[PDB]
Design an enzyme around this catalytic site. Structure first.
Site, PDB file in Angstrom:
ATOM      1  N   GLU A  51       7.445 -20.608   0.664  1.00  0.00           N
ATOM      2  CA  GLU A  51       8.554 -20.477  -0.215  1.00  0.00           C
ATOM      3  C   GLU A  51       8.389 -21.291  -1.492  1.00  0.00           C
ATOM      4  O   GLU A  51       9.025 -20.972  -2.417  1.00  0.00           O
ATOM      5  CB  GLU A  51       9.869 -20.868   0.497  1.00  0.00           C
ATOM      6  CG  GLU A  51      10.231 -19.998   1.643  1.00  0.00           C
ATOM      7  CD  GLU A  51      10.832 -18.638   1.229  1.00  0.00           C
ATOM      8  OE1 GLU A  51      10.970 -18.341   0.035  1.00  0.00           O
ATOM      9  OE2 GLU A  51      11.165 -17.855   2.116  1.00  0.00           O
ATOM     10  N   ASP A  97      14.199 -14.663  -7.093  1.00  0.00           N
ATOM     11  CA  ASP A  97      13.192 -14.601  -6.050  1.00  0.00           C
ATOM     12  C   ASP A  97      12.388 -13.307  -6.283  1.00  0.00           C
ATOM     13  O   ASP A  97      12.545 -12.698  -7.341  1.00  0.00           O
ATOM     14  CB  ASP A  97      13.813 -14.764  -4.652  1.00  0.00           C
ATOM     15  CG  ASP A  97      14.605 -13.541  -4.195  1.00  0.00           C
ATOM     16  OD1 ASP A  97      14.714 -12.535  -4.894  1.00  0.00           O
ATOM     17  OD2 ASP A  97      15.137 -13.577  -3.090  1.00  0.00           O
TER      18      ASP A  97
END
Ligand SMILES: [Cl-]
Ligand SMILES: [Cl-]
Length: 162
Positions: free
Chosen positions: A11, A20
């Site tokens: 991540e 994202d």
């Protein structure tokens, strides 16, 4: 290696609101803020998550606090889910981490839709689950990350991350 290090690798860490891979406002270590296109909506979810006036920036400690909460909530979502819990209980420790990684990324509802993969993971048909997991939007959108998680399920080792 452990779930915290695994997820930190997959991540990253960003201290400022960002979009994202799906275009959703996110901060910290993959902490999704909102699916809404509004940046003001994201900032307000952030202030509420952290309990202060952030102006879209947080510290490392705060990023790590959200992270801890999210890992915890992912685990507890697995255990309360009737489809996920039996699979999870059947797995060894390393492959349990792979299940948490997927839930963290896509939510318990999303993973619980991997019905055929789940059944094969439960029967410990590792190569066949790997093949079936790869036939998914998830794999086609984020193949590098997906391969790492699939390899973990296939081998039971942390090799894809070392
Ligand atoms: Cl929160
Ligand atoms: Cl990826």
């Amino acid at each position: 290696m452990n779930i915290f290090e695994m997820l930190r690798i997959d991540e990253g860490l960003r201290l400022k609101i960002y979009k994202d891979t799906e275009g959703y406002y996110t901060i910290g270590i993959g902490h999704l803020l909102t699916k809404s296109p509004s940046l003001n909506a994201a900032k307000s979810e952030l202030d509420k998550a952290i309990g202060r006036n952030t102006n879209g920036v947080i510290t490392k400690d705060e990023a790590e606090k959200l992270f801890n909460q999210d890992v915890d909530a992912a685990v507890r979502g697995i255990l309360r889910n009737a489809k996920l819990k039996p699979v999870y209980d059947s797995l060894d420790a390393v492959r349990r981490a792979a299940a948490i990684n997927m839930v963290f990324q896509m939510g318990e509802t999303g993973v619980a839709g991997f019905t055929n993969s789940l059944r094969m993971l439960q029967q410990k048909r590792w190569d066949e689950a790997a093949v079936n997991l790869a036939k998914s939007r998830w794999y086609n959108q984020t193949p590098n990350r997906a391969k790492r998680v699939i390899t973990t399920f296939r081998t039971g080792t942390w090799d894809a991350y070392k």
